[model samples]
Target: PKSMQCKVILLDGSEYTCDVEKRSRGQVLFDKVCEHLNLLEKDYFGLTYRDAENQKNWLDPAKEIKKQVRSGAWHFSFNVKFYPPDPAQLSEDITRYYLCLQLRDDIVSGRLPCSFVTLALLGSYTVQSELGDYDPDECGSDYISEFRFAPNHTKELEDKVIELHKSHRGMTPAEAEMHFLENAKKLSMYGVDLHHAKDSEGVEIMLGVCASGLLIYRDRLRINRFAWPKVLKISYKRNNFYIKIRPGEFEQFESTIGFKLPNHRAAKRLWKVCVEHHTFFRLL
Candidate 1:
């Protein structure tokens, strides 16, 4: 099929409108499936990275990237080499992955897609880097060429790269697989493949615990970081949940389990702002 006249790039890191009719019905549906599949894979990887034993600060930058996604500091978008890109000839999953690399501006701007989770999972096992997270400069902007730089090259980002490499140094291949499989299973809950059907008109609500500690397994880590941290954060809050949690960062939110996640009343005014814009997920 010719490029489905339905293609559009994300603007200012928000909103995506595709022309479904421009492409064959199969193409549109297949691409949607692939997008969700990739989202599942990303969550699987994020869980692995967080669960890694003896983790280091080098992982911090990527973790920060995930943080940006959740806090709504960024938006997820893709770039296609073929305009009205042909959805038929290319493997949609691979094509989506390829386009992810082209939008380095989003990554550098501290707005990376939830796909970062899967890419990190792959990074854990392989010595090689993927296009999007590996080299930011490999892709460029028509207007902003000179300012381009890969994120991993930054001191903070490079620290995460080196740290992960070190953390995995002693692991046997079997050990690594064990780590991946364990978390991958947990990530399956929010896995996009599991969604029964599109619920476009059903409010698309996401119910999270009011207790900040609801998802905690010892630390602030959730069951699956990529989904809650990246994809769902983007989905439910529309990029408003992007947050950074260092030690003590959320101490003011301390409260008991099975109760509404406690929040800082001092921040109530800010919370009101988030609520007004649907940026704050439910408080309880």
Candidate 2:
């Protein structure tokens, strides 16, 4: 029953190769990799892979290994998926520090979308965590250079970061990190990874499954939203994606919205994401 070689890559570019049984679930392999890394906050990360279609996907820990990867040599990535809800509870300082840097990169790249004001707030939090409180005498030009990674980042963002950092003058590292996480989690797109798709009309849209519910966006603007309570059922058939919305107070009947994906596989992948998101946010 046991036969397959798997290679796992860490966020920092470290690699670990091992063998696993075909029947093993993704969770078992993830645990093996996390244990090898000596990572304390194991639940915060997962193993991800790219499908044949070149789509990056997180392996479903509960699903059979063969379902995700065929019985052959394969490679996977280890990275943070869900942010630790309580950063203070992390057993190791390195874990918290890594998360700070990861989030910093995300914010800078605009992958973690938020307003400039919110980004500034997060920037300040990151600054406080890494460099301690704001001090003009202490924080020199070299120190400020660390924050300017994104090409599109503006002077206003830099100014706002400085302004907010000044306001958090006396915050302890613990206090600053916690405060940053608290505010960052409040944003609608926090921890959300969107999957790209098009509607039946071929309008490009982004679909996100978050703590709140399913979100639909055209470019960066959210065009529609379906909270969990309003989501009756989600399903797919062939190349058609269907979302059954429950009857609302203003609505007289339940409605099912449908979209035609590029292919049957794309539709199934979208359906799988909805299932995983619903189970993660709603059930657990």
Candidate 3:
């Protein structure tokens, strides 16, 4: 077997290129990325690629990389897959920094839509971390414009960020990052991993698996929610991933609500994320 060429985009928005054997699983490449950054909290991160559907999928750690990715699409991105509910207590600055990077990507990618004020506030903290305290001399430049904070950014928003930034000085990068989490965590989609699927009624919808529990999204709005304790079991048969849970005593025995994933592979992928989140939440 010969080595295959691959590229991984780090959280810092930087690229790393490497070659791997045909036998190398996705985790091997993940390890290389982690090693490069000296990042210890590896479990929270995963590599991902966009399929022909233009939807992103996490690279499974066990299988040969060639089998999972699309043909001619060798480029993969290293991103934080499972977002921590309480990043402020995570005990590492690097972890929080990476979280900020993902949130920024989420905003620019249009997945996470923040209010203008919220966007400006978060941007202020971002500048604080990058420039460390607001200096009139340093902040006067167009450094903020160079950064694509939002997909449709303009001088209008940059001034607000500068205004907010002027109020804070002498805070370290760690401090600004902590402030970012304090605000960013309030977003409804913060830790959510939304998977496209159909509800029991066969209507197309989104199933949200996040730090809290399972959520049902219809019309791009969350219509239902089930906490971790309320969920009794998780299983899937073929492409149908069912959620069996008793939301409250008013409910019957349990809800074996069958939701259809796009494919068997997708069904199991959602199952894995569900199981891992439940396990981690319970342990904590």
Candidate 4:
């Protein structure tokens, strides 16, 4: 296959053109975008596009470039999937603003994936950044109208933001943003991808990994946890998920615990989570 030239669009309406090979993976294209922009936190962003169904799909880094983008398409968007834990962590207002934009997209897409309370808090932060503290006589429609991004944002979300702002009447915009980040970071699976599976007893569970460690949940309740130091090795075979234990001096057994997932994909996804969590928390 031949190389092609395409345009990459960023959320802030910035665009750049680059040459991409059919054999190159999505990561290569993503790296090219980052290089062009000279981004410091490159991993925080991803390349995404809308499919024929108009649903947004992130380009898979592991897939061939030709498979991810049809030959006819000329543009894709570089967007954020994970927000920086703290707005202050970002040196520039532009970076923090981009993180805010992604949070707005997550809220609008119904992909916040957390409790309604969490949604309300996040929405409040967005409002504070854009509209300041809540005014009792503030018009919801007007507030939504003033939103520069996310043209189709909902009134219900705007209402929730207003309600939350009522409780934070005295807080400054920076204070509100900091509070939002603090609470958001406490959620174990906040910015991480999650996979569902069942344990040996057929109990459904949610598995996710992040910079902290491996987290296991039954519904919203975190039932079990394994920090990177305690995990000896993680592996999968067919429908089975295995974690070999590294016994501490006070521990009795160093045996492996195996759980039966519904399929090989589920087991492998969980194994991948383990690998990622271990690499980030332990290695880096």
Candidate 5:
């Protein structure tokens, strides 16, 4: 009797064991983890695993565990599969908590790029969330000095974090978390997942998919945005990805735009993610 010994890691980096029958699919294991957290709002969360080809795929809820296990290890990451455009609008505090953890990961990993000021401000909100109200007696800069907020983290930013935290003295962890989300959602890269592709002119660009819609980025700057309402469809053929747009958003823009992606799988990956984001955020 070879039962599966699976581990599910949450965004907070804490994990739990999910011993399951080999015949079981991911839904059972996912339910167990949500049970552990008493989490009712779990639609945004899902278990992610890499297949033998190193392609990232969500554990299919209807498929058997054996099919998705990685080299005999059933390790899965519980991630925010659907990032909400505005976390504050989420009905529950726990949902926002998880979102905060994800955004924190996004910022620290350079996935959700932002200004230095935003970094410090977010750091302060985190300090408010975990460290509580700022206390001069809690030992000066060392209090927040240990926080690793961004790739370019520095003592200067650390000091700014403290200054920001000081003004948020009375903010509860919940309020601080709310404040954090309010600030983060305004960032251009907040929920964007960038896919590398080239324009018609063969110029290098990144196509970003997020809750708001599709984005075109060059030199790390968001140059074009097509909201979900404007995007009619996204499809791929061979190494090319295409976007069907609603006419009149921009007179100069074509009703359809095509770009060349790196490979078949890359194009497929982008299409799937675009569909996932659009379904999760745009659909009613």
Candidate 6:
């Protein structure tokens, strides 16, 4: 598992420190590194909404709210960029890994705030790779990162949703909701250690967004579909690496076994499940 230190600056001009590492594969690609406001805001939380709008999909309705100090109270910023990486070169991945490490160190040192992360990356994305013929999204070339924040944790802001056919025990729907809301703040942060995670493209983004403590909206329903299938029982050469896989085991050979590459049918079906099956109903 890979480990790094994060220095964060708060809105009130205070500094904070956190231990960060790659917590998963695929999930790391979308990791949005951030700073802390206070101890109450732990560095371990997950994103609420999944499948945000991009150049391909435009129906993503989650609005990321940003704070505007110079203008007044609140502001909003939501946009996405696609800098597809070249399909060649192992060094590209290493370069991206190194860049993320630099970013991890910068945020942990208190030189930057959790909120200003998007602006900081603007300059980094403009440079060119020595190999040239680059896609901005390429790990060795120039790539873009997305940043967003909602008023509440994706799960906290939206209540009264019953996605599955599970029982609510003795508590009423309102009662169950009240229970979750009270403890919401404590479980907001979902920290990811890149050291423990993998270099796989898909899981990298998923884990990064979830661990950044930014997902606090009704849109986080995408999480129900994710699974850590490729990660091994223990990450040795990957140092500081650790991830949670369902029926957890060393799946490093799933590709060689029966699973075919680019088999996204399961992922697509799960996305539909969240959309169709995620409806409100009284508990059994």
Which sections of candidate 4 miss by over 4 Å? 4-19, 35-38, 46-87, 90-93, 108-118, 131-141, 145-157, 163-179, 219-222
Go through the candidates in order and give the clash count of each.
15, 0, 0, 0, 0, 63
Residue 233 C-alpha lDDT in model 6: 30
Query: Taking the tens digit of each residue's C-alpha lDDT, what string does model 1 give over 65-169?
Result: 333223222222333212111222233344333333333343344333324443344334332222112333433222212333344433443344434544564
Candidate 2 stretches greater than 4 Å from native: 1-7, 11-23, 36-44, 71-73, 80-102, 134-139, 144-167, 218-222, 248-253
Runs in model 6 deviating more than 4 A are 1-11, 15-183, 186-205, 208-233, 238-284
Give model 4's clash tally. Answer: 0
Q: Which residue pairs does candidate 2 place in steric collision?
A: none
Global local distance difference test of model 3: 0.83
TM-score of 5: 0.88
The lDDT, on a scale of 0 to 1, for candidate 1 is: 0.30
Return the top candidate by lDDT: 3
TM-score per prediction, in order, is 0.23, 0.76, 0.88, 0.68, 0.88, 0.17
Better of 4 and 6 by TM-score: 4
**Model 6 worst lDDT run, 10 consecutive residues:** 75-84
Q: After superposition, how far is residue 33 of candidate 3 from its true place, in Å?
A: 0.4
- Per-residue CA lDDT of model 2 for 151-241, tens digit only, reads 3677777877888888887788767877777776676667776777787688988877665677888775547878866787999998888
Please give, for residues 1-284, the per-residue lDDT of candidate 6 as tens digits: 76444343333235444443533321221233222211221112222221222111211223221110122221111111111122122133432332232333334443223433232222222111222223324333212222112222233211111111012323443333233222221223212211112233324322222212112122356532222223223122212222233343654533311111122433332232223211211110
In model 3, which regions exceed 4 Å deviation?
A: 52-54, 70-73, 138-141, 220-222, 246-252, 262-268
